Amino acid sequence: SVKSEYAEAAAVGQEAVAVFNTMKAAFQNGDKEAVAQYLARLASLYTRHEELLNRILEKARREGNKEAVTLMNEFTATFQTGKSIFNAMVAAFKNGDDDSFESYLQALEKVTAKGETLADQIAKAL
Numbered sequence: 001s002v003k004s005e006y007a008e009a010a011a012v013g014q015e016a017v018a019v020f021n022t023m024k025a026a027f028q029n030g031d032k033e034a035v036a037q038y039l040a041r042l043a044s045l046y047t048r049h050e051e052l053l054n055r056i057l058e059k060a061r062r063e064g065n066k067e068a069v070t071l072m073n074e075f076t077a078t079f080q081t082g083k084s085i086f087n088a089m090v091a092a093f094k095n096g097d098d099d100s101f102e103s104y105l106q107a108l109e110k111v112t113a114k115g116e117t118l119a120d121q122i123a124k125a126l
Helices: 002-029 032-062 066-094 098-114 116-125
Strands: none
Touching: 002 032, 002 098, 002 116, 032 066, 066 098, 066 116, 098 116
16 A cells, blocks of 8 residues: 555665664764765665655555645655755765765754654655
């Protein structure tokens, strides 16, 4: 069901949360080789999550589930914000700009923390 596919996508999301927090520790500790690998892993988790979210939205649309479509449109818009911040963080790491990497890291945390009540609303809506 779309609801079980949402639980799967949510789990991939939570894996990224786990990897992100680990990477943050590695950044603070100055273990740049670890950070590089965690950024690669996160890129792959965000790309997967983004694809699953699109399949859930398309399915809600085909099902005529107007409320779920509304919430998923809002949630996926916010996802793209996160993706843009992530991609800026990755570029800051490439460029050796630790000040920007810090800034983007904190912003990505607040953007994700903000979009949690909505994530929980979508679970119930599908």
